[PDB]
Write a protein that binds this ligand. Structure first.
Ligand code: SF4
Ligand code: SF4
Ligand code: SF4
Ligand code: SF4
Ligand code: SF4
Ligand code: SF4
Ligand code: SF4
Ligand code: SF4
Ligand code: SF4
Ligand code: SF4
Ligand code: CA
Ligand code: K
Ligand code: K
Ligand code: K
Ligand code: K
Ligand code: K
Lengths: 329, 130, 81, 269
């Protein structure tokens, strides 16, 4: 429905695929295209309202399947394939240097990065030890001494004690037929032995494994995982270097940029006490990738993005070098 | 209304098949849709009103009756017979046995009449073969 | 292309869109603070004769703030051609 | 050497043609191939009564390529128990395509009926359209099913794919309905699309991989955690998968079900 495929068959097959669900509407593909084949719809409208249209439109009569748009996209939304292989696996094509990884030996499966990730790209699992391995003790009920008062069963905090209650009959003239302690549930608190009115109860007092996974298609290299991690197990490198500039007086706090930002850089801080004033639009550039979506979305141009470097090895092709340099400002 | 159609026996449908499938008592026992009173209230119908049942496989008109054997919420019951077999799932899943029970159907009130046994069978358009 | 479109026949003239719009708020301190403009000003839209009326469509950035502010869908962002 | 079978109008009473295979065509002239017997209901007929025949004969089945140049939607058992060579069907097939085959390759360009590759021992079956129920299954009553070979369906398949599977591999590129891998003992089933319900029901061993969504699953499975960038019998599957062991309704069950994390959060406990 909303995805677009531009394809051309022949001696060499070339196929450009656009995935609408991955697009952040940053506008970089439209800016880089040397033949202006792409038209990107308004950023705020595509994010904040219901639209039947795709986020971008690719003109088949202008596109030459060069792959510059696929290379620059920071969101993995555009992929150019040549004879079935993606340009990210072909060294002839300039590639942006970026990464995100978790060191499995250092990670303690705390799940803070999973919660913090703005793109839900992380999966953190953990196998907790069984409860019985985190307590030590012995417990035994003398069933001959037990009068089935039910006080231990009621007071047990984990429901480890079970009594087989019954209504007496002339054939079975008893209020219960058995009492048992589930030793896998018992936490050896000692409550049951202390409440028993006939002293029928005697009671006396594994590392965390897991998996860590970063989805490379959803990850945008924001660095939230690296910063939030308490043991420094996560490492991230970004595609671009730059600066954000906000004019607090021009901003009218419409919240468009806050909603648009795919890296959760921007926020509206709440005052801690009555009468306190806060910064109208708060940024933390440690999480910024300099995509430009915020600036593009702002109707009053109160927020601007400067891009100082695009991290690659030296670009050999003059056409590609000129296109990448046009995105610096 | 979207509902789940269950089908099967009633003692009354049993008495009717053994008395005669050509009698009025067979139409009264098997050309019916049993429903909980709450569903009849949702649809705006009373016992004796007709209902048009439409599935992906066919359509039929049957008479609404209050269920004496309570149904789970959202389920209806048509007794086994040619009225039920206009709308249940024919496919056998390579077992030989059709899906006679628990089929999604659309039910609405109708002023159309229930078809008697010979009239219902005319929908198939039998052509003489000798 | 996507642009601002009014449906005055559905409009209550409530003014939520006029006030919510960051372009209007930047151009008019009265609008920023919830009032209709009294000082002469050039803004995107105003409530006139009881309904929303688009005056300067070229100033719209198609952000969608006005759209979220209207519960009766009387101001929209849609394909104009 | 190519032998071309051009179908005449297919009959309403289906044909059963287990003799359409390189093993029977080997060493026969074009005129002898036209006299090959097939069933048309309760009558024995000649292959030539329902197909035009042309091409070049060959003495060994490994050098024979049978091309059915048309739709054979009402022809059953094509390629049954073949050991070598190739069959290409430029259209649909009915039930039992490649049933019990030991080697060679069958390509169906259209759809296939139920029991495609039933009791397969070796070779390859490739269906470019959809398949029916019982892809790579066993026969009624038998506890020993498919023991080898690869079956690939590019479209969708229905119920009980790999029923009582005891080796080999089944790949469904589309969706399946219910009970894939029912009573599976060994082998590998990969479903690239979705499953409605009961994957691995009563399985004792083998592996099932679901890349799409399982709408419903089974309480007899134990959740083992997540595994990433898995490899099963040489097949590399990138990404994260919820891992389950079962079906523990069966004594000594060691079967594994992998389900893609992205669309199966509701299946994990
Ligand atoms: S570059 Fe930005 S706008 Fe273009 S496809 Fe990627 S995310 Fe969408
Ligand atoms: S492949 Fe090249 S020509 Fe086509 S849209 Fe992308 S940048 Fe423009
Ligand atoms: S408290 Fe003592 S007497 Fe009462 S039920 Fe428990 S064990 Fe038996
Ligand atoms: S020790 Fe505490 S947990 Fe164990 S049975 Fe007695 S009351 Fe329950
Ligand atoms: S870099 Fe950002 S997007 Fe990538 S996994 Fe870490 S938190 Fe998620
Ligand atoms: S925040 Fe650090 S320790 Fe905690 S789960 Fe993520 S990588 Fe592992
Ligand atoms: S910077 Fe622009 S987009 Fe962001 S809240 Fe302020 S006015 Fe709205
Ligand atoms: S704040 Fe940074 S990451 Fe967020 S939208 Fe703006 S440029 Fe992109
Ligand atoms: S368009 Fe909607 S928000 Fe704006 S004045 Fe009319 S009813 Fe109020
Ligand atoms: S879309 Fe944004 S800029 Fe345009 S009128 Fe609505 S609120 Fe103002
Ligand atoms: Ca069997
Ligand atoms: K998250
Ligand atoms: K208790
Ligand atoms: K840190
Ligand atoms: K802007
Ligand atoms: K609205």
């Amino acid at each position: 429905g909303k995805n677009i495929t531009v394809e051309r068959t022949g001696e060499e097959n070339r196929r450009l695929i656009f995935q609408d669900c991955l697009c952040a509407v940053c506008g970089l593909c439209g800016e880089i295209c040397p033949v202006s084949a792409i038209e990107v719809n308004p950023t705020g409208a595509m994010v904040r309202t219901e639209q039947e249209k795709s986020k971008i439109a690719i003109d088949e009569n202008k596109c030459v399947l060069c792959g510059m748009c696929s290379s620059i996209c920071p969101f993995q939304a555009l992929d150019l394939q040549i004879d079935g292989t993606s340009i990210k696996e072909l060294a002839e094509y300039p590639k942006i240097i970026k990464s995100a990884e978790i060191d499995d030996e250092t990670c303690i499966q705390c799940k803070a990065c999973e919660t913090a990730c703005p793109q839900d790209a992380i999966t953190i699992t953990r196998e907790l030890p069984e409860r019985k391995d985190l307590v030590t003790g012995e417990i035994e009920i003398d069933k001959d001494t037990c009068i089935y008062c039910g006080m231990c069963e009621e007071m047990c905090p984990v429901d480890a004690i079970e009594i087989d209650h019954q209504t007496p009959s002339s054939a079975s003239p008893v209020v219960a037929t058995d009492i048992r302690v589930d030793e896998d549930k018992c936490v050896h608190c000692g409550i049951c032995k202390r409440i028993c009115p006939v002293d029928a109860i005697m009671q006396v007092c594994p590392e965390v494994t897991g998996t860590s996974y970063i989805d490379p298609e959803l990850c945008v290299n924001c660095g939230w995982c690296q910063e939030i991690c308490p043991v420094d197990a996560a490492t991230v490198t970004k595609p671009f270097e730059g600066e954000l500039i906000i004019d607090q007086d021009t901003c009218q706090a419409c919240e468009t940029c806050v909603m648009v930002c795919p890296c959760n850089v921007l926020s509206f801080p709440k005052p801690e006490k009555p009468g306190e004033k806060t910064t109208k639009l708060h940024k933390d550039e440690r999480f910024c990738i300099y995509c430009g979506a915020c600036e593009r979305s702002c109707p009053v141009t109160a927020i601007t993005v400067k891009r100082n470097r695009i991290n690659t090895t030296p670009i050999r092709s003059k056409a590609w070098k000129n296109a990448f340099d046009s995105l610096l400002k | 209304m979207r509902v789940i159609l269950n089908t099967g026996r009633t003692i009354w449908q049993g008495q009717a098949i053994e008395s005669g499938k050509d009698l009025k008592m067979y139409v009264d026992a098997a050309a019916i849709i049993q429903m909980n009173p709450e569903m009849m209230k949702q649809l705006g119908i009373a016992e004796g009103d007709n209902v048009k049942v439409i599935s992906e496989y066919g359509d039929v008109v049957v008479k609404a009756v209050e269920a004496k054997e309570p149904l789970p919420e959202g389920m209806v019951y048509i007794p086994m017979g040619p009225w039920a077999n206009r709308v249940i799932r024919p496919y056998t899943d390579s077992t030989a046995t059709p899906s006679f029970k628990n089929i999604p159907v659309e039910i609405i009130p109708t002023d159309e009449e229930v078809l008697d046994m010979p009239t219902l069978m005319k929908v198939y358009g039998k052509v003489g073969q000798i | 292309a996507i642009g601002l479109k009014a449906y005055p026949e559905l409009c209550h003239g409530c003014g939520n869109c006029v006030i919510a719009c960051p372009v209007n708020a930047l151009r008019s301190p009265e609008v920023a603070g919830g009032k209709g403009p009294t000082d002469d000003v050039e803004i995107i839209m105003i409530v006139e004769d009881g309904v929303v009326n688009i005056k300067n469509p070229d100033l719209c950035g198609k952000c969608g703030t006005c759209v979220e502010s209207c519960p009766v869908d009387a101001i929209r962002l849609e394909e104009l051609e | 050497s190519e032998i071309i079978l051009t179908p005449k109008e297919q009959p309403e009473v289906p044909l059963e043609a287990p003799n359409i295979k390189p093993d029977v065509f080997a060493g026969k002239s074009i005129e002898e191939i036209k006299n090959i017997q097939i069933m048309h209901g309760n009558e024995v007929v000649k292959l030539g009564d329902f197909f035009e025949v042309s091409g070049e004969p060959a003495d060994a089945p490994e050098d024979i390529k049978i091309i059915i140049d048309g739709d054979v939607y009402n022809t059953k058992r094509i390629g049954q128990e073949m050991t070598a060579g190739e069959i290409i069907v430029r259209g649909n097939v009915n039930m039992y395509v490649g049933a019990g085959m030991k080697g060679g390759k069958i390509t169906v360009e259209g759809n296939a009926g139920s029991w495609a590759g039933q009791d397969m021992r070796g070779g390859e079956i490739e269906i470019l359209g959809d398949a029916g129920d019982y892809v790579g299954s066993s026969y009624r009553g038998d506890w020993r099913g498919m023991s080898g070979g690869t079956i690939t369906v590019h479209g969708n398949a229905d119920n009980e794919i790999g029923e009582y599977m005891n080796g080999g591999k089944i790949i469904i590129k589309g969706d399946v309905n219910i009970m894939p891998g029912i009573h599976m003992n060994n082998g590998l089933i990969i479903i690239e699309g979705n499953v409605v319900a009961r994957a691995g029901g009563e399985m004792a061993g083998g592996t099932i991989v679901v890349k799409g969504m399982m709408q419903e699953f089974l309480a007899g499975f134990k959740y083992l955690g997540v595994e990433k960038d898995i490899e099963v019998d040489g097949e590399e599957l990138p990404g994260a998968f919820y891992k389950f062991e079962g079906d523990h309704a069966i004594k000594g069950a060691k079967g594994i079900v992998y389900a893609a994390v992205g669309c199966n959060g509701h299946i994990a406990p």
